[PDB]
Amino acid sequence: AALVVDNGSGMCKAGFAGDDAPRAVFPSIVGRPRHQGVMVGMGQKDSYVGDEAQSKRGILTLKYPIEHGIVTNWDDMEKIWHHTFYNELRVAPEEHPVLLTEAPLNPKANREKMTQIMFETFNTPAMYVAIQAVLSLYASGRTTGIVMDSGDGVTHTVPIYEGYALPHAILRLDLAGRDLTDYLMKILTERGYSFTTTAEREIVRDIKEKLCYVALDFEQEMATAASSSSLEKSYELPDGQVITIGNERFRCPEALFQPSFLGMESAGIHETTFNSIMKCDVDIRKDLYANTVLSGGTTMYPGIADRMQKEITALAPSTMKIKIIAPPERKYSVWIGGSILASLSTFQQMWISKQEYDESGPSIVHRKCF
Amino acid sequence: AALVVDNGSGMCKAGFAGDDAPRAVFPSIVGRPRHQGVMVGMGQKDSYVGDEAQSKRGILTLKYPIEHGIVTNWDDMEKIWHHTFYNELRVAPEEHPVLLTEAPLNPKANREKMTQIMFETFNTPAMYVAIQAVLSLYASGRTTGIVMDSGDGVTHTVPIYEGYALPHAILRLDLAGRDLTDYLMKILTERGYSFTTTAEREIVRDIKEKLCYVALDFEQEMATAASSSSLEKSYELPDGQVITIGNERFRCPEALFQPSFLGMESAGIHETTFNSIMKCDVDIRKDLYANTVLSGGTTMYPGIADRMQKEITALAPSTMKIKIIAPPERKYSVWIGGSILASLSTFQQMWISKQEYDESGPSIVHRKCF
Amino acid sequence: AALVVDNGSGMCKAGFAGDDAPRAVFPSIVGRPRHQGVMVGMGQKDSYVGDEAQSKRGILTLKYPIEHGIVTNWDDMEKIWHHTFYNELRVAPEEHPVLLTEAPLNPKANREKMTQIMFETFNTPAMYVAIQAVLSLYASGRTTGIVMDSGDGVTHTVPIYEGYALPHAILRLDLAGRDLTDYLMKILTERGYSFTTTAEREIVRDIKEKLCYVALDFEQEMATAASSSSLEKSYELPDGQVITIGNERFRCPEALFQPSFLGMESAGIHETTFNSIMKCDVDIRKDLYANTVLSGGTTMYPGIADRMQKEITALAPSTMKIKIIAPPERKYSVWIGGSILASLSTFQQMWISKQEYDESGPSIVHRKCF
Ligand SMILES: Nc1ncnc2c1ncn2[C@@H]1O[C@H](COP(=O)(O)OP(=O)(O)O)[C@@H](O)[C@H]1O
Ligand SMILES: Nc1ncnc2c1ncn2[C@@H]1O[C@H](COP(=O)(O)OP(=O)(O)O)[C@@H](O)[C@H]1O
Ligand SMILES: Nc1ncnc2c1ncn2[C@@H]1O[C@H](COP(=O)(O)OP(=O)(O)O)[C@@H](O)[C@H]1O
Ligand SMILES: [Mg+2]
Ligand SMILES: [Mg+2]
Ligand SMILES: [Mg+2]
Question: How far is B107 from chain C (nearest CA, A)?
Fold first, then answer.
C-alpha cells in the first residue's frame, strides 16, 4: 500500500493509499525547551514534534520547518518525516511508495532535497511529488476546473481543462493562514490582548479557527459591529482569562480579499482566481467559471464561498455562470486526491524508482514530476 | 551512602539518603555563657550547639549563624556542621557525599563558602547544593507544580513545569517564621507578657507552634474573639506561670498574608504565589493552579491550606481549579525530597567531585548547581 | 503657544512649542503614605507627585500610572497631568493646545481616554496624539530613517521613508528600562545587596543610570571582569553604605540585546531593528541602514551606539553602510520633535478641535491621529 503524505506549511497529513481520510493529522512544528531542566531522572527529550510539542508548548520554542511552502530547516524537516513514518503511521518507509505534495512555482532545490532525503535517509522504493492544486481536483471527481488551494503558507490557483493544466496561468500568492494569524495577533493589541511568544501564536490560531468568518459585505459588517454588540464573541484562554472580540472576527479573513491590510501590493484571492482564468484561452473560461473549487484549511471560514461567488461575479461577465464548489471536507482535499491518484493503475508507472534516482540523481524529479 | 543536610535558618535536619525521615533534627543555634562560672572541676564548654544549648539556654546567649537563609557567622556554622557529622550522625564526612540545600536568589558567596568548607574543612569526597523548593517537589512525587517553601528565614516560590523550572518567575520574601516569632513577642506585650532575651524568644516560638492558627476570615475571627472567650487558650511557662492569649493566636500567622503588620511593603504569601504563577507562560498556569505545594515548618499552622485556597481562588479565574497540596509531613518535605534525589542513579554524575573543586576553586558550584 | 507633553512610562517631559528643551522634567510617579501620621498641625498631603514623591519616597509607596506605555491607573494619571499644567508649567490648559505622545500598537482605549480627559477634565481647545518614534525623526531634521525609541516601558521601531511610514513594518517590544531596573534589582542579590521596596527600586535605577554601560563584546567583557577588578565601581547609598558592582555594570544593559536573560522569547533590539528594516521594501532598505536613529533614555548607555552598529553590520549585507545616529540630546528627542511639529504652520489644521470632539466623541482620535 502506498503512503500519501500531504506536507503543508502548518499541518502534516499522512495515511495510506485507498483510504478516504488521513490516518495521522498533527501540526508541523518542532519544539525545543527554552529553560533549564531541574528534575533529574524524568524523560526530558531534546526536541518535541507534532502533538507532543503542542501540549508542552508552555516551556517550548515552536519552530515551523516549512515557511511559505518552502522548507527552511531540513534537519527539523527530517524529524517530522521520521515522526510521521515511525510514530504516527508506525510503518517502515522502505516497504511502501510515498506520494509527496508541493506547491507550484516552488524553488527547484526544494523538491530535489525531498528526492534525495526520501531515497537516502528513508530508503524508499518509489516516490512521486505532485502539485497540491492538481490533487484537489482528483478528490472532487473532476477533470475541468480551476482550484484555489489556500493553506498555511501558500495560496495558489491552478486551472485545469480536460485534464490539461495551463502553467502560464498558474498564480501564486505568499498570503495564507499564517499571515492571517500574525495579522490577528497585531489587531488583538487594539483590545489590550498581547500575544507575542510562539506558544501564544498557537492560541491565536485556535481563536482564528473558531471565531473568525468572512463577511459578505465588509463595509456593511463594519457598521453593524460598530452599532451593537451582536457580533461580539467570547473566548477562554488556557489560563482561564476570557477575551472578547468584535469586528476582529471578520477583519482578519478580510486580508485575503484586501491584501493591502498587511501592506502587500498583491491582489486579493478573488482577483487572483479571476486573473488566472483570464490568462487562459477564451474557449475554456466558461467551464472554469462554473468549476471553481476551493481547497485548504484557509478556505474553511464560514461565508468564504458566498463572498467568492459575489466577488467573482462582479468581475466576470453577467452572462457567465459562477459556481463555487466548496466540499465540507476540502481541508483534506489535497490528501484525498493524493490517495485516489496513488491507487490508480495508470499511475504505477509514474513512480520514480530507486534505480532511476541512482542513475540520475536528485534531478530526476524535474523530468518525471510536473 | 550519601548524606542529606537541610540547613534552614532556624532548624537543622540531617540524615542518610534512602531514609524516609531525618535521623538528626535539632535547632540551629550556638549558645555561649554570659555569666561567670564559679564551680571548679565541672565541665563547662566554651559553647553549646543544638539541643544542649536549648536545654541550658537559661545561662546562655543563643545565636543563629544563619539569618534569612544567609550564613552571617561562618565560624559558628562550622560548629553546627561539626556537631551534625560527629555528634548527631556520628559519621566521617570524608567517607560520604554531602547534599546541601539553599534558598534561591542567595548571595553567590554563600554557596562558595559552603563549597570551600565542605572540601577543605571536612574533606567531603563530593558535594552538591540544591534549591529547597525544587527538593520539595521530589517528595510529593510530582514533576509539575509551584512550591511555596516557607521556613524560619526565607519564603520563596519556585514554579516547575514538566521538570523545567522558570527562574524568571522565582519570587523570594524575607518574611518567615522568625519574623512571626518576633511579631508575636511584640504583640504579647499587649497582655503584659515581656519576653526580651534570646532564651525567652525560644519560649515564644514554642507558644507559636502550639497555640497559633490561621483564620479563614480574619475580620470575622477578630469579632468573635472580641465578643467571647472561646478562642482563649492557656500556656504554662517553664517557671510555672500561666499565660492566656486571645486574638494573638491568629494575628501572628496573619502577618504571612498581611506583611504590612510588620511594616513591610511586600505582598502576602497568597499574592506572591499568585504573582509567581502569573509570571509563567499562559499555557502552564492551569497546571500550576492545581498543583500548589506547601513546604516548610511555617506552613504547619492549622487551617493555612484552607486560607491559601480561599485567597488564591479569589485572585485566579473562576474556571481554574485551585488545589493546595499540604501533606502532613511537609515540615520534612525538603529533606525527604533531598533523600530521593540523592539516591537516584541519574544523579550520581551531578556531584561536584574533589578533583573538579581542586582544578576550578569554589567557583565550580555556580556551573554545576542550579 | 502650544504645549508639548511627552508622557513616558517613567518620566513626564513638558514644555512649550518653539522651545529647544523641556521646561519641566519629573518622574512619572504618585506616592502615598504607608505609615500613620503622628504629628498634628503638619501639612501632610494625601499623595505626592513627581519630584516631591521622589524626595519623600522613604515613607511612601511609589506607583507608576503607566505600565508598558499603557495607562493602568487613570485616576493617578489626572494627578500627574494636573501637576504638570498647574504646578510645573504654571499654565491653564484650557488656553493652550496640547500635543501628546503615545507608543505605536497601543490599545485603542488608551488614546480614547486621553482625548476624553483632555477635553472634559482640562477643557483643552485643541488636542493631538503623535507617535513617539515619528517625533524623534523631526528632531534629527530627517524625512527618511528608522527610529529605535526605547524608554521606560516600550521599545519600538518605526521606519519612515520620504515622510511615509510603513505601519506593517512597525515592531514593538515590551522590554525597556524598567525591565532592566528589575533585572539589575535581581542580579544585585548575587553580591548580597538586597533591594525590595518601591523606594529602593528608585535607588537601583539611579545606580543603573550612573554605572551601567554596554559592552562591545559581552563574552570578552565577561573574561575581563573575571580576571581583574578594573571594571569594578563604587556607589554610595543614601544611608552612607558603599556598594561595589563588577560585571553587573554591563550585564544589565545586555538584556536589551539578549532578552533571554529575563526569560523573554523576543529578539534583541539589534535584531528587532533589522527585522523592521527587512519588512520594508527592498528599494528603501539602503536608506534606512544609513539613517538609523536612536531615541529615549534607554539608549543613553555609553557604547550602545557602537554595539548597535556592530550587531546590525553582522546582520546587514557587507555592502551596506550602517550608520547609527545617536545625538547627545536623544533623551529629549521625542519632546524636541514634538516641539518642532507643534510649531509648523502646516500642522495647525490637524489639531482635533473641541467642535470635532463634541460631534464625534472620543473616537475622533482614531480618524485624525496616526
Ligand atoms: N476551521 C478553520 N477556520 C479557519 N482557518 C482554518 C480552519 N482550519 C484550519 N485553518 C487554517 O488552515 C491552515 C492550514 O490548513 P491546511 O491547508 O489544512 O494545512 P497546510 O496548510 O499545513 O497544508 C492553518 O494555518 C489554519 O490556520
Ligand atoms: N507546628 C508548627 N506551627 C507553626 N510553626 C512551626 C511549626 N513547626 C515549626 N514551625 C516554624 O518553622 C520554622 C522552621 O521550620 P522548618 O522549615 O522545618 O526548618 P528550617 O526553616 O530551619 O529549615 C521554625 O522557626 C518554627 O517557628
Ligand atoms: N544616562 C542613562 N543611562 C541609562 N539609562 C537611563 C539614563 N537616563 C535615563 N535612563 C532610563 O530611561 C528611562 C526613561 O527614559 P525616557 O525615554 O527619557 O523617559 P520615558 O521612558 O518615561 O519617556 C528610565 O527608566 C531610565 O532608567
Ligand atoms: Mg495544504
Ligand atoms: Mg527549610
Ligand atoms: Mg520616551
Answer: 4
